[PDB]
Design an enzyme around this catalytic site. Structure first.
Site, PDB file in Angstrom:
ATOM      1  CE1 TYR A  80      -7.321  -1.769  -3.994  1.00 44.80           C
ATOM      2  CE2 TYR A  80      -5.239  -2.902  -3.885  1.00 44.80           C
ATOM      3  CZ  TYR A  80      -6.544  -2.775  -3.489  1.00 44.80           C
ATOM      4  OH  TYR A  80      -7.079  -3.657  -2.580  1.00 44.80           O
ATOM      5  CD  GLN A 130       0.246  -1.659  -4.841  1.00 46.21           C
ATOM      6  OE1 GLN A 130      -0.759  -1.600  -4.140  1.00 46.21           O
ATOM      7  NE2 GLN A 130       0.599  -2.753  -5.487  1.00 46.21           N
ATOM      8  CB  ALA A 139      -0.926  -0.010   1.215  1.00 45.56           C
ATOM      9  CD  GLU A 186       0.628  27.210  10.147  1.00 46.04           C
ATOM     10  OE1 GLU A 186      -0.508  27.361   9.651  1.00 46.04           O
ATOM     11  OE2 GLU A 186       1.609  27.912   9.823  1.00 46.04           O
ATOM     12  CB  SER A 206      -1.625  -0.510   4.919  1.00 40.07           C
ATOM     13  OG  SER A 206      -0.616  -1.498   4.993  1.00 40.07           O
ATOM     14  CG  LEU A 211       4.871  19.413   7.385  1.00 40.16           C
ATOM     15  CD1 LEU A 211       6.270  18.801   7.379  1.00 40.16           C
ATOM     16  CD2 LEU A 211       3.883  18.479   6.766  1.00 40.16           C
TER      17      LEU A 211
END
Ligand SMILES: CC(=O)O[C@H]1C(=O)[C@@]2(C)[C@H]([C@H](OC(=O)c3ccccc3)[C@]3(O)C[C@H](OC(=O)[C@H](O)[C@@H](NC(=O)c4ccccc4)c4ccccc4)C(C)=C1C3(C)C)[C@]1(OC(C)=O)CO[C@@H]1C[C@@H]2O
Ligand SMILES: Nc1nc2c(ncn2[C@@H]2O[C@H](COP(=O)(O)OP(=O)(O)OP(=O)(O)O)[C@@H](O)[C@H]2O)c(=O)[nH]1
Ligand SMILES: Nc1nc2c(ncn2[C@@H]2O[C@H](COP(=O)(O)OP(=O)(O)O)[C@@H](O)[C@H]2O)c(=O)[nH]1
Ligand SMILES: Nc1ncnc2c1ncn2[C@@H]1O[C@H](COP(=O)(O)OP(=O)(O)O)[C@@H](O)[C@H]1O
Ligand SMILES: [Mg+2]
Lengths: 428, 361, 441
Positions: free
Chosen positions: C224, C15, C12, C254, C140, C252
């Site tokens: 996918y 991909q 995952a 915030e 995942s 990031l």
């Protein structure tokens, strides 16, 4: 990389494996000289799951053959794909068992299992990271049961953490091709359920029905039955050899399909199977396959699932397809036929996909299913067995080679307890 | 034709080594109920067991000394052993909780075992007449990576040797071990010698916990044979009676993961925890088997159960005790036991479906 | 400088990352061979930015990412595809064997012997960075690698590095759909540690994206690849403030500040504007108000969780392209006027806003369309309780029979490490029930 050995025993195994290799070689593009003549580079990125390498870009399988008494040794050698096998791995003996589990477990097999395990070690220690082992043996017969179970009991001692995967031909209910089937099958199941991670219970009457009803074949020989069993053997490992969108492996199946350890007796299947003429009128999509998988007749195991519940299901797919269609169809099956599945697990199906299909098809599949229906098989034997044991029909041949009644009773009361462990979950 | 389990616990008091460091108590009790509150004061787990032995302070009422543990747990096993039933007792606790002070004890404050055994011999010498006779055999074996071994045998003058002892299912008398020694015992001075000869050959090892940590389950069997039946038309017994007592010591549920274990020490915590899981499944099956629900009892997944199909199940009486610590440094070590022994839930939110109504002609 | 590190775990993870780095290489005018003809022609600009793509001397550009799977069949498809020459050859195929869809292997018996190389590479990438940081783990649940390795890596990065931002953009499991049966156990065991060591974990649910794809884009038979492109667009909307220019930038820090009130309620949801296909790219204005109404419209949430059965505690809205803030304000007030969108009493402010002038891009081979503007919403709501309790029930049905445990005790996990996690999620199911209560005197 992950690697597999293929032990190959008995008059069924030594005939199955030739067909299995004559199938994988066509997948990886190998000819019976061991050379390569394929067209896609994917065939050799991951060829080493089964094949080793020789010097001149030849490839030789990791096949072990154990009781090739010359009638079968020569039958493989005097064959199309017999040249490639390693001759030092063509193990054999003489004075076979003669449909006797003892002569293949205690007396003769004990003389030869050392020589066999030597080849097993010599092949394994060449591998980088072993993933598991295979076997393809008959039950009810003598050597495929005896020597196979012996090798299993010793390999799992030497190599416990790894997988052992026995694809077995269990006895038929009606037409028995051997009258000592129950004793041998019971004594073998007593040693398989303890010392095995997953085994896939094939039966021949179901394959005959599959070949006469679905393929509309009028002359089905054993090679056409093996031609199926091999497809399943290949469909189980397509996720390990070839790539896809959601990979898998034997360990994943053995984890998700074996909730409890003793409940590792399975029912395989494979789509799409059709007649040569009736391929012009069938749409090749996913739901057609999914229908043809959960049907009661594609079952290779001779056990109507509808009489019980599927504890767990695994579906491997091959081809350029979706993932939404797969999940949707499997959810539809989980929701429609709710009674035929279990309640204390909310999801009882998993998936695996490879993006590279079979040589002549566009998209295939392979089915594995653990059910409470398979107990029927081990009920039949437990009715066939005890009637033979009371009046001690075929018993003297098995005492005369160094056994006793006690062991047989152990095997009976390890089968019946397992039948009960299945029957626990099918009422409500 | 029912059974019992009678799960219980035992909270030790602080050792001086832990009492001078001013370690914070993390285990309180309310009579039958027990509780565990962190030093952080955000969560409070509260458990309920059929029995609770509170051995923290001598001043508290309900003080459960050694003799209290005896009269509360071990004597009914003694009774059912006389009544022709088999008994099985279990002791659990991770290292540092003092299982040994609960089972065996000290030479000034005994434990369970010797009190049990001396009550046995006293009851024998009381009921011993010319008609009746009592004969006792014993055995003391172990389990290690699911292989069976005997601790009572003197090891051969040899190298490292794993023993060929394997199991076998007699169809009637049940499972047993092929080749297990059965020595005879008369007075406790002999059984002490046999046990102390046994423990030294046990499988142990050092870890982050201690140099002294057991790594193999122990089973200690006492087979008691009553011979009273005598025929009136001739000197013959129509039958004898046999009772199997089985006192058992368990290994600690190692978290191999947090101990950075590797190798042979990782191949034990994987077997130990498996046996404990199968044992918990079996006892949670038995507790339902007492409530009429028909279920399966997997005695086969583990040797420690397979050798005990007859004792744990049927017209018998199991028993357990679990040692914990009230210190706030062994919390995760401790709560696992409290969560491993959650087999006192027998009347906790059961449903109801009954159809038989007004049966008549 | 302003730089991030992107980690991916499992099939995952890779991909998602292939689509993400495809999108990144497309935006900055980068080609698959690391090179730029765009800078060779323009002769200026920081277009292949140092935020994601570091820079050697030959004009090449090298990603600030690695990925590991313990499952070589994925990474070896990166080492043979179009993007083999871009990445550093240190993509960690330690995949001599899979992690068997279990957490015990990934956290201890097959994560050992692998993790140290990953820490070495993370240090090598951190030392190249002279400033801001932040890890983007794409993993995942349910799966064994994406759970175990994530836990074993985050508990080590909370040790070595500590006071940095760590964000998990992970795939929640669907309640009906699932491609496994051991999903819930592994999910719960991951939560048990990632409730502590992470800072904000954005979740998605593949069933939600399936419904979004068939309902809006008119795609009947997805793959996918059609989902991971939407997810890459989500991430690009997150990161455009850091890479590119704009009026209101959201770093990031915030996101983890404004959306995480309490340390344990940092499991938000995300969405976009995929009512946007090529044929329906016409016939629609695609203003700001319409999209801000759509981002709260159910059946467009990327997690199947009806929010009207719960409440919102915080929201951030990140706009791309041509936006005038008075439209943004009219849109926000139009939501605050409505009563089918409940807010907590203690967050009347409600919204964060971020704007970036760069519009999205269009991957060739894409199901989306070209837009002059696009939106990404990131909300923290109580409704995800209903998304936890399902996995809290399935577990409790199965663990009662102690199924699927023997494979996990086979690799060191105790019987009692489960109940230690289940009670943690029982607490988190309470700390979403006390936060949604209105205060009283
Ligand atoms: C015009 C055309 O498409 O020919 C097909 C064909 O007609 C059908 C019927 C094939 C045909 O299968 C059979 O005739 C058959 C006979 C006995 C037992 C089983 C099958 C086919 O022979 C089988 C063969 O299938 C394969 O080759 C697969 O790769 C299979 N390998 C082999 O069959 C094989 C056998 C010996 C040597 C080398 C390869 C396979 C697939 C996955 C995993 C392992 C093996 C194919 C495409 C066909 C023919 C040739 C007619 C089918 O084959 C399978 C196993 O799915 C039967 O149903 C499928 C559907 C195909 O349409
Ligand atoms: N969104 C999205 N999810 C994916 C994709 N591929 C796999 N998954 C998810 O991955 C889960 C299956 O387990 P994985 O995360 O793949 O575990 P793994 O990567 O195979 O690693 P192991 O657990 O060790 O086998 C499923 O729940 C899927 O939803 C993908 O391409 N996109
Ligand atoms: N499917 C299949 N089964 C076979 C084949 N040959 C034999 N068998 C089965 O194997 C059984 C006989 O076992 P056998 O190998 O002769 O016993 P062994 O020699 O002692 O191992 C019978 O029940 C057959 O159904 C074959 O080619 N294919
Ligand atoms: N009820 C009690 N009162 C006083 N001390 C106790 C009590 N229970 C246990 N202990 C102490 O615990 C110690 C035993 O711990 P130990 O047996 O080494 O742990 P384990 O039983 O796990 O091997 C003894 O020295 C004893 O002093
Ligand atoms: Mg994986």
């Amino acid at each position: 990389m992950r690697e597999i050995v293929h032990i190959q025993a008995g008059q069924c195994g030594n005939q199955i494996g030739a067909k299995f290799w004559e199938v994988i070689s066509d997948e990886h593009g190998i000819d019976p000289t061991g050379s390569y003549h394929g067209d896609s580079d994917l065939q050799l990125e991951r060829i080493n799951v089964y094949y080793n390498e020789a010097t001149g870009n030849k490839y030789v399988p990791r096949a072990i053959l154990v009781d090739l008494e010359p009638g079968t040794m020569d039958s493989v050698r005097s064959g199309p794909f017999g040249q490639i096998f390693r001759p030092d791995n063509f193990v054999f003996g003489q004075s076979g068992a003669g449909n006797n589990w003892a002569k293949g477990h205690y007396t003769e097999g004990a003389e030869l299992v050392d020589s066999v395990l030597d080849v097993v070690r010599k092949e394994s220690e060449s591998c980088d990271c072993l993933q598991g082992f295979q076997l393809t043996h008959s039950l009810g017969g003598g050597t495929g049961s005896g020597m196979g179970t012996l090798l299993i009991s010793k390999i799992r001692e030497e190599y416990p953490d790894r997988i052992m995967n026995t694809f077995s031909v269990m006895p038929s209910p009606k037409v028995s091709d051997t009258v000592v089937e129950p004793y041998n099958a019971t004594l073998s199941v007593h040693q398989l359920v303890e010392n095995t991670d997953e085994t896939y219970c094939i039966d021949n009457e179901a394959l005959y029905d599959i070949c006469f009803r679905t393929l509309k074949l009028t002359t089905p020989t054993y090679g056409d039955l093996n031609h199926l069993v091999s497809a399943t053997m290949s469909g189980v490992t397509t996720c390990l050899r070839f790539p896809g969108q959601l990979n898998a492996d034997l360990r994943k199946l053995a984890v998700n399909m074996v909730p409890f350890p003793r409940l590792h007796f399975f029912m395989p299947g494979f789509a799409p199977l059709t007649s040569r003429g009736s391929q012009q009128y069938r749409a090749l999509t996913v739901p057609e396959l999914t229908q043809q998988m959960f049907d009661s007749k594609n079952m290779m195991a001779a056990c109507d699932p509808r009489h019980g519940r599927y504890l767990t299901v695994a579906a491997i797919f091959r081809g350029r397809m979706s993932m939404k269609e797969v999940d949707e169809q499997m959810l539809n099956v989980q929701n429609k036929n709710s009674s035929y599945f279990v309640e204390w697990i909310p999801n009882n199906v998993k998936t695996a996909v490879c993006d590279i299909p079979p040589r002549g098809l566009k998209m295939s599949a392979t089915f594995i299913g653990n059910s409470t229906a398979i107990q029927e098989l081990f009920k039949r034997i437990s009715e066939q067995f005890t009637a033979m044991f009371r009046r001690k029909a075929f018993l003297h041949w098995y005492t005369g080679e160094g056994m006793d009644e006690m062991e047989f009773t152990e095997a009976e009361s390890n089968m019946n307890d397992l039948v009960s462990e299945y029957q626990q979950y099918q009422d409500a | 034709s029912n059974s019992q389990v009678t799960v219980a616990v035992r909270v030790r008091p602080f050792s001086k080594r832990e009492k001078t460091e001013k370690a914070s108590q993390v285990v309180f009790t309310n009579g039958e109920e027990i509780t565990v509150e962190h030093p952080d004061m955000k969560q409070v787990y509260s458990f309920i067991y059929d029995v609770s032995f509170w051995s923290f302070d001598e001043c508290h009422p309900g003080y459960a000394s050694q003799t209290t543990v005896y009269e509360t747990l071990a004597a009914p096993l003694l009774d059912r052993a006389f009544e022709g039933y088999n008994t099985c007792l279990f002791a659990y606790g991770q290292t540092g909780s003092g299982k040994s002070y609960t089972m065996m004890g000290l030479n000034e404050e005994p434990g369970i075992i010797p009190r049990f055994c001396e009550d046995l011999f006293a009851q024998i010498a009381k009921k011993q007449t010319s008609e009746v006779s009592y004969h006792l055999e014993m055995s003391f074996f172990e389990v290690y990576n699911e292989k069976i071994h005997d601790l009572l045998v003197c090891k051969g003058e040899n190298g490292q040797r794993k023993q060929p002892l394997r199991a076998r299912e007699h169809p009637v008398s049940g499972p047993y071990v092929e080749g297990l020694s059965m020595n005879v015992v008369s007075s406790y001075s002999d059984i002490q010698s046999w046990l102390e000869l046994g423990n030294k050959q046990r499988a142990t090892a050092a870890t982050g916990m201690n140099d002294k940590s057991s790594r193999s389950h122990s089973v200690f069997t006492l087979v008691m044979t009553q011979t009273k039946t005598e025929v009136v038309e001739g000197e013959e017994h129509d039958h004898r009676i046999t009772s199997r007592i089985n006192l058992v010591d368990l290994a600690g549920s190692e978290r191999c993961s947090t101990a950075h274990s590797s190798g042979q020490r990782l191949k034990e915590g994987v077997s130990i925890n498996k046996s404990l899981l199968t044992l918990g499944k079996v006892i949670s099956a038995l507790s339902e088997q007492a409530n009429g629900k028909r279920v399966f009892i997997p005695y086969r997944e583990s040797t420690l159960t397979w050798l005990l199909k007859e004792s744990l199940g049927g017209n018998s009486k199991t028993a357990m005790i679990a040692t914990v610590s009230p210190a706030a440094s062994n919390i995760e070590e401790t709560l696992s036991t409290l969560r491993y022994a959650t087999q006192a839930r027998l009347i906790v939110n059961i449903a109801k479906v009954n159809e038989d109504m007004n049966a008549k002609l | 400088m302003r730089e991030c590190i992107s980690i991916h775990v499992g099939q995952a993870g890779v991909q998602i990352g292939n689509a993400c780095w495809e999108l990144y290489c497309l935006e900055h005018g980068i080609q698959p061979d690391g090179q730029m003809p765009s800078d060779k022609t323009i002769g200026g600009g920081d277009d292949s930015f140092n935020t994601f793509f570091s820079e050697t001397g030959a004009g090449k550009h090298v990603p600030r990412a690695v990925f590991v799977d313990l499952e070589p069949t994925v990474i070896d498809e990166v080492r043979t595809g179009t993007y083999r020459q871009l990445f550093h050859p240190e993509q960690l195929i330690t995949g001599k064997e899979d992690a068997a869809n279990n957490y015990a292997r990934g956290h201890y018996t097959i994560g050992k012997e692998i993790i140290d190389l990953v820490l070495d590479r993370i240090r090598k990438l951190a030392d190249q960075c002279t400033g801001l940081q932040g890890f983007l783990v794409f993993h995942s649940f349910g799966g064994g690698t994406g759970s175990g390795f994530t836990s074993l890596l985050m508990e080590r990065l909370s040790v070595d590095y500590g006071k940095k931002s760590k964000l998990e953009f992970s795939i929640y499991p669907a309640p009906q759909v699932s491609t496994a049966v051991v999903e819930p156990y592994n999910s719960i065991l991951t939560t048990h540690t990632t409730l502590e060591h992470s800072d904000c974990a954005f979740m998605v649910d593949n069933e939600a994206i399936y419904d979004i794809c068939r309902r809006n884009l008119d795609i009947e038979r997805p793959t996918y690849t059609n989902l991971n492109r939407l997810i890459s667009q989500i991430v690009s909307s997150i990161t455009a403030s850091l890479r590119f220019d704009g009026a209101l930038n959201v770093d990031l820090t915030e996101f983890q500040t404004n959306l995480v009130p309490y340390p344990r309620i940092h499991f938000p949801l995300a969405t976009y504007a995929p009512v946007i296909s090529a044929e329906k790219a016409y016939h629609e204005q695609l203003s700001v108000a319409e999209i801000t109404n759509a981002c709260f419209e159910p059946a467009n949430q990327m997690v199947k969780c009806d929010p009207r059965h719960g409440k919102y505690m915080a929201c951030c809205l990140l706009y791309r392209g041509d936006v005038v803030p008075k439209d943004v304000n009219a849109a926000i007030a139009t939501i605050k006027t409505k009563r089918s969108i409940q807010f907590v009493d203690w967050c009347p402010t409600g919204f964060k806003v971020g704007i970036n002038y760069q519009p999205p891009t269009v991957v060739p081979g894409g199901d989306l369309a070209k837009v002059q503007r696009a939106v990404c919403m990131l909300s923290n709501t109580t409704a995800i309780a209903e998304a936890w309790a399902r996995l809290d029930h399935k577990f409790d049905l199965m663990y009662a029979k102690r199924a699927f445990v023997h494979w996990y005790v086979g690799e060191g996990m105790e019987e009692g490490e489960f109940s230690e996690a289940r009670e943690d999620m029982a607490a988190l199911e309470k700390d979403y029930e006390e936060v949604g209560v209105d205060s009283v005197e």
